[PDB]
Amino acid sequence: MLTDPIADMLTRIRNATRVYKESTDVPASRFKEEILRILAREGFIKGYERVDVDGKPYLRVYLKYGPRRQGPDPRPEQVIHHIRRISKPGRRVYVGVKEIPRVRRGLGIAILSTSKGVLTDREARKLGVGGELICEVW
Amino acid sequence: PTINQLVRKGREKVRKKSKVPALKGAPFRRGVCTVVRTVTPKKPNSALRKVAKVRLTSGYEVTAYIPGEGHNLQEHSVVLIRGGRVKDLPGVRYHIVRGVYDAAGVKDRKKSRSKYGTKKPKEAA
RNA sequence: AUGUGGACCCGCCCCUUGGGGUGUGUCCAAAGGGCUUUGCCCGCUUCCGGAUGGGCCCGCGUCCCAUCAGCUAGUUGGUGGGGUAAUGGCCCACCAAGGCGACGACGGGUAGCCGGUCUGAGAGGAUGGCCGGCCACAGGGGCACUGAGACACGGGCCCCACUCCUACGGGAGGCAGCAGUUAGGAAUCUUCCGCAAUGGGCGCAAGCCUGACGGAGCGACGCCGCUUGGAGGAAGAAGCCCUUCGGGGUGUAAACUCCUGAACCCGGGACGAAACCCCCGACGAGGGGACUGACGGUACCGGGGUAAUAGCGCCGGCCAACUCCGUGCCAGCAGCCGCGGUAAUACGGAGGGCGCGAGCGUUACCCGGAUUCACUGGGCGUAAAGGGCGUGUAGGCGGCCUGGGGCGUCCCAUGUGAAAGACCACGGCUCAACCGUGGGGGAGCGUGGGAUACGCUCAGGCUAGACGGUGGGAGAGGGUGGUGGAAUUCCCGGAGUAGCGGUGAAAUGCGCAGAUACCGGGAGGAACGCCGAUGGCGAAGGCAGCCACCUGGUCCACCCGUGACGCUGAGGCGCGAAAGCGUGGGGAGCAAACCGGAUUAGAUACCCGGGUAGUCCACGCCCUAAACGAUGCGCGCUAGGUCUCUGGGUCUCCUGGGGGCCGAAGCUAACGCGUUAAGCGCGCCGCCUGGGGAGUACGGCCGCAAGGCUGAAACUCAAAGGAAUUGACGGGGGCCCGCACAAGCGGUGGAGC
RNA sequence: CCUACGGGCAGGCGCCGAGGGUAGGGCCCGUGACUGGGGCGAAGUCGUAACAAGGUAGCUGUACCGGAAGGUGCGGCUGGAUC
RNA sequence: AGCCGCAGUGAACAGGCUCUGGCGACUGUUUACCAAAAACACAGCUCUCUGCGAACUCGUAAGAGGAGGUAUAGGGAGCGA
RNA sequence: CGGUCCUAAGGUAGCGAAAUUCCUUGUCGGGUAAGUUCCGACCUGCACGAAAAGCGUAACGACCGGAGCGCUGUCUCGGCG
Ligand SMILES: [Mg+2]
Ligand SMILES: [Mg+2]
Ligand SMILES: [Mg+2]
Ligand SMILES: [Mg+2]
Ligand SMILES: [Mg+2]
Ligand SMILES: [Mg+2]
Ligand SMILES: [Mg+2]
Ligand SMILES: [Mg+2]
Ligand SMILES: [Mg+2]
Ligand SMILES: [Mg+2]
Ligand SMILES: [Mg+2]
Ligand SMILES: [Mg+2]
Ligand SMILES: [Mg+2]
Ligand SMILES: [Mg+2]
Ligand SMILES: [Mg+2]
Ligand SMILES: [Mg+2]
Ligand SMILES: [Mg+2]
Ligand SMILES: [Mg+2]
Ligand SMILES: [Mg+2]
Ligand SMILES: [Mg+2]
Ligand SMILES: [Mg+2]
Ligand SMILES: [Mg+2]
Ligand SMILES: [Mg+2]
Ligand SMILES: [Mg+2]
Ligand SMILES: [Mg+2]
Ligand SMILES: [Mg+2]
Ligand SMILES: [Mg+2]
Ligand SMILES: [Mg+2]
Ligand SMILES: [Mg+2]
Ligand SMILES: [Mg+2]
Ligand SMILES: [Mg+2]
Ligand SMILES: [Mg+2]
Ligand SMILES: [Mg+2]
Ligand SMILES: [Mg+2]
Ligand SMILES: [Mg+2]
Ligand SMILES: [Mg+2]
Ligand SMILES: [Mg+2]
Ligand SMILES: [Mg+2]
Ligand SMILES: [Mg+2]
Ligand SMILES: [Mg+2]
Ligand SMILES: [Mg+2]
Ligand SMILES: [Mg+2]
Ligand SMILES: [Mg+2]
Ligand SMILES: [Mg+2]
Ligand SMILES: [Mg+2]
Ligand SMILES: [Mg+2]
Ligand SMILES: [Mg+2]
Ligand SMILES: [Mg+2]
Ligand SMILES: [Mg+2]
Ligand SMILES: [Mg+2]
Ligand SMILES: [Mg+2]
Ligand SMILES: [Mg+2]
Ligand SMILES: [Mg+2]
Ligand SMILES: [Mg+2]
Ligand SMILES: [Mg+2]
Ligand SMILES: [Mg+2]
Ligand SMILES: [Mg+2]
Ligand SMILES: [Mg+2]
Ligand SMILES: [Mg+2]
Ligand SMILES: [Mg+2]
Ligand SMILES: [Mg+2]
Ligand SMILES: [Mg+2]
Ligand SMILES: [Mg+2]
Ligand SMILES: [Mg+2]
Ligand SMILES: [Mg+2]
Ligand SMILES: [Mg+2]
Ligand SMILES: [Mg+2]
Ligand SMILES: [Mg+2]
Ligand SMILES: [Mg+2]
Ligand SMILES: [Mg+2]
Ligand SMILES: [Mg+2]
Ligand SMILES: [Mg+2]
Ligand SMILES: [Mg+2]
Ligand SMILES: [Mg+2]
Ligand SMILES: [Mg+2]
Ligand SMILES: [Mg+2]
Ligand SMILES: [Mg+2]
Ligand SMILES: [Mg+2]
Ligand SMILES: [Mg+2]
Ligand SMILES: [Mg+2]
Ligand SMILES: [Mg+2]
Ligand SMILES: [Mg+2]
Ligand SMILES: [Mg+2]
Ligand SMILES: [Mg+2]
Ligand SMILES: [Mg+2]
Ligand SMILES: [Mg+2]
Ligand SMILES: [Mg+2]
Ligand SMILES: [Mg+2]
Ligand SMILES: [Mg+2]
Ligand SMILES: [Mg+2]
Ligand SMILES: [Mg+2]
Ligand SMILES: [Mg+2]
Ligand SMILES: [Mg+2]
Ligand SMILES: [Mg+2]
Ligand SMILES: [Mg+2]
Ligand SMILES: [Mg+2]
Ligand SMILES: [Mg+2]
Ligand SMILES: [Mg+2]
Ligand SMILES: [Mg+2]
Ligand SMILES: [Mg+2]
Ligand SMILES: [Mg+2]
Ligand SMILES: [Mg+2]
Ligand SMILES: [Mg+2]
Ligand SMILES: [Mg+2]
Ligand SMILES: [Mg+2]
Ligand SMILES: [Mg+2]
Ligand SMILES: [Mg+2]
Ligand SMILES: [Mg+2]
Ligand SMILES: [Mg+2]
Ligand SMILES: [Mg+2]
Ligand SMILES: [Mg+2]
Ligand SMILES: [Mg+2]
Ligand SMILES: [Mg+2]
Ligand SMILES: [Mg+2]
Ligand SMILES: [Mg+2]
Ligand SMILES: [Mg+2]
Ligand SMILES: [Mg+2]
Ligand SMILES: [Mg+2]
Ligand SMILES: [Mg+2]
Ligand SMILES: [Mg+2]
Ligand SMILES: [Mg+2]
Ligand SMILES: [Mg+2]
Ligand SMILES: [Mg+2]
Ligand SMILES: [Mg+2]
Ligand SMILES: [Mg+2]
Ligand SMILES: [Mg+2]
Ligand SMILES: [Mg+2]
Ligand SMILES: [Mg+2]
Ligand SMILES: [Mg+2]
Ligand SMILES: [Mg+2]
Ligand SMILES: [Mg+2]
Ligand SMILES: [Mg+2]
Ligand SMILES: [Mg+2]
Ligand SMILES: [Mg+2]
Ligand SMILES: [Mg+2]
Ligand SMILES: [Mg+2]
Ligand SMILES: [Mg+2]
Ligand SMILES: [Mg+2]
Ligand SMILES: [Mg+2]
Ligand SMILES: [Mg+2]
Ligand SMILES: [Mg+2]
Ligand SMILES: [Mg+2]
Ligand SMILES: [Mg+2]
Ligand SMILES: [Mg+2]
Ligand SMILES: [Mg+2]
Ligand SMILES: [Mg+2]
Ligand SMILES: [Mg+2]
Ligand SMILES: [Mg+2]
Ligand SMILES: [Mg+2]
Ligand SMILES: [Mg+2]
Ligand SMILES: [Mg+2]
Ligand SMILES: [Mg+2]
Ligand SMILES: [Mg+2]
Ligand SMILES: [Mg+2]
Ligand SMILES: [Mg+2]
Ligand SMILES: [Mg+2]
Ligand SMILES: [Mg+2]
Ligand SMILES: [Mg+2]
Ligand SMILES: [Mg+2]
Ligand SMILES: [Mg+2]
Ligand SMILES: [Mg+2]
Ligand SMILES: [Mg+2]
Ligand SMILES: [Mg+2]
Ligand SMILES: [Mg+2]
Ligand SMILES: [Mg+2]
Ligand SMILES: [Mg+2]
Ligand SMILES: [Mg+2]
Ligand SMILES: [Mg+2]
Ligand SMILES: [Mg+2]
Ligand SMILES: [Mg+2]
Ligand SMILES: [Mg+2]
Ligand SMILES: [Mg+2]
Ligand SMILES: [Mg+2]
Ligand SMILES: [Mg+2]
Ligand SMILES: [Mg+2]
Ligand SMILES: [Mg+2]
Ligand SMILES: [Mg+2]
Ligand SMILES: [Mg+2]
Ligand SMILES: [Mg+2]
Ligand SMILES: [Mg+2]
Ligand SMILES: [Mg+2]
Ligand SMILES: [Mg+2]
Ligand SMILES: [Mg+2]
Ligand SMILES: [Mg+2]
Ligand SMILES: [Mg+2]
Ligand SMILES: [Mg+2]
Ligand SMILES: [Mg+2]
User: What's the topology of domain A3-80?
Assistant: First the structure.
């Protein structure tokens, strides 16, 4: 049914990285890409190619992971430690340029859709705008 | 609960039951004694605690504790209520202020005199 | 009378809700008083503006109970009037039958609202007392008058109640104004001074009134500042404590010696005051002069000048501070956990110590901690919590592309958000509390412009969701009508004896009136052995011999059709094991109640023999449950291994839908869960908020009834609990030992000592 | 009565009207002989129902019965021992 | 919209109302001539007899009622929605 | 709760000073200024009790008891016609 596509993707990613894999797909969307467009440019991931799955257009998303640690649990650190949806379809979150977040005192990023396209916690403050606060990642 | 539910129901505000109603909300309450007796306490304890059944202003009648050692309270004694239960004595959530009306403070009290309504004694001469 | 002008009727013009203007008709005004008068001033009159203060209306915001669910006749709209400064159903006629409510109407309960205030990290929570804005009231009600304005605290009329005067022959009064009295109460003040200042009214102005106001008075009620002193002073007196009798403590503390010296004494003594007024200039400007202080001779200044109030709580743990004695579950402490039973750091006193200080405590109440109503910021397998299961209403939520609109949302700009307070810096009372000055701000809402990603909305298109077609599969899914065999029981016949039944052992019971056991015949009711499964079907309850008819759901292959038509779902509606109910049937077996036999101290039980309802059918109820996977529904995502049911295929295998087990990651308090999540996520509904009281009571709805749903409170307890751990125990299990039984021989228990 | 007289005032009747009266209802509070359970409180009386296979596995909805816990019937749950 | 009287169903012919117990469910029946009731009956419930030339009743009988009915029928009995 | 004697078995439910309760005008409560009756209770039921039914019941009644309002020659207490 998918009452929330965006969230589905975020979770689609969250569930892959947790088990460590090279790439997981996700249904194509103009709005969906502009979101991944942020993660690439912010290095949160590698990239993605508008691949195709049985006539249906998906988006093979490529994940980065830290260096193979040693000792008990050699599994590497996460490039994307945490990601959760903010403005959900059951509750939209709208903030002005003065009410913008502050993920991990700068150490993180926040993605929001505004009247000037898909921006960042920063760009929003730089541009001087504000809109629906999508999520947070670090 | 979904956020939708919260706009429907709303979170109900707790509210709080007063442990000292007979007072009617004020700190103290002038009254009058009716029966003065000694009652066996409860729990693991044992004794004969001095209590009083008090007819007060607000047409109420509750049991009140008489603190210290020895009192001068008869049947038609005037008195003042304090508030605060005993515990060992089920069904009695009010203390009696000493040295007021017909309640004289404990005689020969030297320690905590603030309560027990005993005034400062004379030292040497 | 005069009309600069104003008012209204009509036409006209512009604007455009009765705004401005025009024309024409009619209607409309006045006040004098004092003079250094013959000129000013103080006023009068109508108008158009200014300013200030309002009235009315509108959007949004504004508590508790749905255990208040339906409310309304001026009620809703109309027409036309009356009414007012004017809109209005405000009021009155008539017309129509409307208006309001789960977005909570109506009703009950509480409350004056805001600036602010308190707390809180925040968001929030609580609050509206002094000061300021608004509202309302002025003994309870009604009413109108006057007026610019009131339906008027100290104005009027009327009714009521209450009270007071009286030669009773009759009248009076309204403290929620300032003080004061009285009652109520845990409790809240002087029946003070002054109009000097500020403000107000009247006046040309002196001047006048001003319980507004400026002050003084009382109350540690609060915050703030201040004192009861400072230095020296012993190996450290006396006294009082402990003590192992050596000593330790109070303790520089005192004493004592010097030093200052708040209060008090004397003199001085205010800022707060300057104007109005008066003279000059014209009473304009200007300059000059003069007047007036309540607080009070008070603040403050000089000097003289005395060592001068200390109290309260605590010292078991939380929590800072330990000993002796007394006491002996007594007397007593206690916020919680708990202290006291002859050694109590927990009671009572003492010594000593900790903490504060003109205060220290207590009680009460608000926020905090409580993240314990969780927006920020929680839960529902077993701790409180998933509706018994579906269907579906409203509602919330919603897939890929593109365009219009730009509601939400976002930026900018502007208005408003007064002050006071708070915050920030600087000043003023010798500091501070207070106080002045100056500065910083939004949030919100109005207005203008802009942005369009997201939601929305309109438009168009799409196919991955959903539905439909075609052809097939498995199944105790359901309804109806039939029907088979086994067995029990009963009856009839034959044969046949002396007992059968039952139990731990028995008895009651049945049996010579011919039982049990055996054959044959017949009647009848319920239930369906092997297949059968650790299986299948259904939403749940639940469904099983076989047959037919009627009928639901569901799975696979084909990729053909529709083109977001979806998800969830408060109420509503429907289904809902057993027992139970009603009307009729039916009744073999079984079996509450009941009777008898046993056991037992008793045995209203467990066991045995009888046995009624019931168990069965129909129709109509009841609607509960350990209705359970104690796990709501749909969609997506995250290792696999093995067993089984059921499909499809090129049929070792792969692939779909189910049903179990072990398990990656992950979650979990743990037990455990884990592609059938209790994992990672979105949507929606239900429900939880300590245990007992209690699913009780009241009300309400439903029921023939039994009862069901909804569902509290007073009161009471300091816990109630979940999972797991070490133990102990078991009329639990396995293995094992001992003169522990058993096996065998002596005795004791009796007698005398 | 006064007129500035087709007037005003006094006076008269009427609508509404505080409220009083009569009648019948709704809600809530306090109280009541008697009655029901509930809570608490001491070493009271009676039995042993549950916790271990609690010595009849327990629990459960319903039904009947019994001094009391409880017993039994019907169906359900395992939150039940055991080789 | 008015007029008249103390008064207009102006004379006549027309319920007094409420609260609450007992008994009987109710309409009804009864002691002609002292009892109208809580007595009788009543729908309804249960027991019981009766297979049809029924049982039962009347008659010595014949005969008849039951009934030109046939167990959802008929007779007797108690209780009494 | 127990003991004992007896019986065919020892009165359950529900009512209960009752159309039944002698003692009796029981006792308490309510109505009244005052209530042998009335209503509501307790249970000590002389001598209720389940189809000669038990306990209730809306409606009904020229039945019987208790109370209040309205009204009166019933009455104070008669008088007049
Ligand atoms: Mg005009
Ligand atoms: Mg004139
Ligand atoms: Mg003059
Ligand atoms: Mg006003
Ligand atoms: Mg009008
Ligand atoms: Mg007016
Ligand atoms: Mg109008
Ligand atoms: Mg009208
Ligand atoms: Mg509703
Ligand atoms: Mg609304
Ligand atoms: Mg509400
Ligand atoms: Mg009200
Ligand atoms: Mg109020
Ligand atoms: Mg506020
Ligand atoms: Mg504040
Ligand atoms: Mg703060
Ligand atoms: Mg706040
Ligand atoms: Mg408020
Ligand atoms: Mg006040
Ligand atoms: Mg004020
Ligand atoms: Mg008054
Ligand atoms: Mg005004
Ligand atoms: Mg006035
Ligand atoms: Mg007045
Ligand atoms: Mg007023
Ligand atoms: Mg006054
Ligand atoms: Mg006076
Ligand atoms: Mg006063
Ligand atoms: Mg006073
Ligand atoms: Mg007093
Ligand atoms: Mg004062
Ligand atoms: Mg003055
Ligand atoms: Mg003045
Ligand atoms: Mg003047
Ligand atoms: Mg005066
Ligand atoms: Mg004065
Ligand atoms: Mg003053
Ligand atoms: Mg002071
Ligand atoms: Mg004090
Ligand atoms: Mg010393
Ligand atoms: Mg010493
Ligand atoms: Mg010194
Ligand atoms: Mg000196
Ligand atoms: Mg002088
Ligand atoms: Mg002056
Ligand atoms: Mg001058
Ligand atoms: Mg001057
Ligand atoms: Mg002086
Ligand atoms: Mg001096
Ligand atoms: Mg001294
Ligand atoms: Mg303290
Ligand atoms: Mg402390
Ligand atoms: Mg300590
Ligand atoms: Mg003790
Ligand atoms: Mg003891
Ligand atoms: Mg103490
Ligand atoms: Mg001692
Ligand atoms: Mg001890
Ligand atoms: Mg203590
Ligand atoms: Mg002590
Ligand atoms: Mg001390
Ligand atoms: Mg000490
Ligand atoms: Mg204090
Ligand atoms: Mg704090
Ligand atoms: Mg939340
Ligand atoms: Mg929680
Ligand atoms: Mg859940
Ligand atoms: Mg439990
Ligand atoms: Mg639970
Ligand atoms: Mg369920
Ligand atoms: Mg459901
Ligand atoms: Mg239900
Ligand atoms: Mg449902
Ligand atoms: Mg819908
Ligand atoms: Mg929608
Ligand atoms: Mg959409
Ligand atoms: Mg659009
Ligand atoms: Mg602004
Ligand atoms: Mg565009
Ligand atoms: Mg479309
Ligand atoms: Mg087909
Ligand atoms: Mg098929
Ligand atoms: Mg198949
Ligand atoms: Mg089948
Ligand atoms: Mg089938
Ligand atoms: Mg079938
Ligand atoms: Mg035979
Ligand atoms: Mg034979
Ligand atoms: Mg046998
Ligand atoms: Mg025999
Ligand atoms: Mg024999
Ligand atoms: Mg023989
Ligand atoms: Mg046979
Ligand atoms: Mg299934
Ligand atoms: Mg089942
Ligand atoms: Mg089942
Ligand atoms: Mg079918
Ligand atoms: Mg197709
Ligand atoms: Mg098409
Ligand atoms: Mg549904
Ligand atoms: Mg139904
Ligand atoms: Mg059922
Ligand atoms: Mg049944
Ligand atoms: Mg039946
Ligand atoms: Mg039957
Ligand atoms: Mg028996
Ligand atoms: Mg026996
Ligand atoms: Mg015996
Ligand atoms: Mg038996
Ligand atoms: Mg049997
Ligand atoms: Mg029955
Ligand atoms: Mg699930
Ligand atoms: Mg196959
Ligand atoms: Mg599977
Ligand atoms: Mg597992
Ligand atoms: Mg692991
Ligand atoms: Mg799997
Ligand atoms: Mg509770
Ligand atoms: Mg409770
Ligand atoms: Mg409970
Ligand atoms: Mg109930
Ligand atoms: Mg129940
Ligand atoms: Mg209630
Ligand atoms: Mg009820
Ligand atoms: Mg329920
Ligand atoms: Mg446990
Ligand atoms: Mg054992
Ligand atoms: Mg073993
Ligand atoms: Mg032996
Ligand atoms: Mg021997
Ligand atoms: Mg011997
Ligand atoms: Mg011997
Ligand atoms: Mg009226
Ligand atoms: Mg009235
Ligand atoms: Mg009334
Ligand atoms: Mg006991
Ligand atoms: Mg049991
Ligand atoms: Mg037992
Ligand atoms: Mg035994
Ligand atoms: Mg047992
Ligand atoms: Mg068991
Ligand atoms: Mg049952
Ligand atoms: Mg007995
Ligand atoms: Mg039980
Ligand atoms: Mg069973
Ligand atoms: Mg008339
Ligand atoms: Mg008439
Ligand atoms: Mg009549
Ligand atoms: Mg008549
Ligand atoms: Mg009666
Ligand atoms: Mg009758
Ligand atoms: Mg009757
Ligand atoms: Mg009759
Ligand atoms: Mg007759
Ligand atoms: Mg007669
Ligand atoms: Mg006769
Ligand atoms: Mg007679
Ligand atoms: Mg008659
Ligand atoms: Mg007669
Ligand atoms: Mg004959
Ligand atoms: Mg004959
Ligand atoms: Mg014959
Ligand atoms: Mg015949
Ligand atoms: Mg015939
Ligand atoms: Mg018959
Ligand atoms: Mg009879
Ligand atoms: Mg016998
Ligand atoms: Mg009895
Ligand atoms: Mg009984
Ligand atoms: Mg009774
Ligand atoms: Mg009596
Ligand atoms: Mg009496
Ligand atoms: Mg009386
Ligand atoms: Mg009386
Ligand atoms: Mg009388
Ligand atoms: Mg009589
Ligand atoms: Mg009576
Ligand atoms: Mg009797
Ligand atoms: Mg009788
Ligand atoms: Mg008898
Ligand atoms: Mg009899
Ligand atoms: Mg009989
Ligand atoms: Mg009878
Ligand atoms: Mg009766
Ligand atoms: Mg009658
Ligand atoms: Mg007469
Ligand atoms: Mg005569």
Answer: Ribosomal Protein S8; Chain: A, domain 1 (3.30.1370)
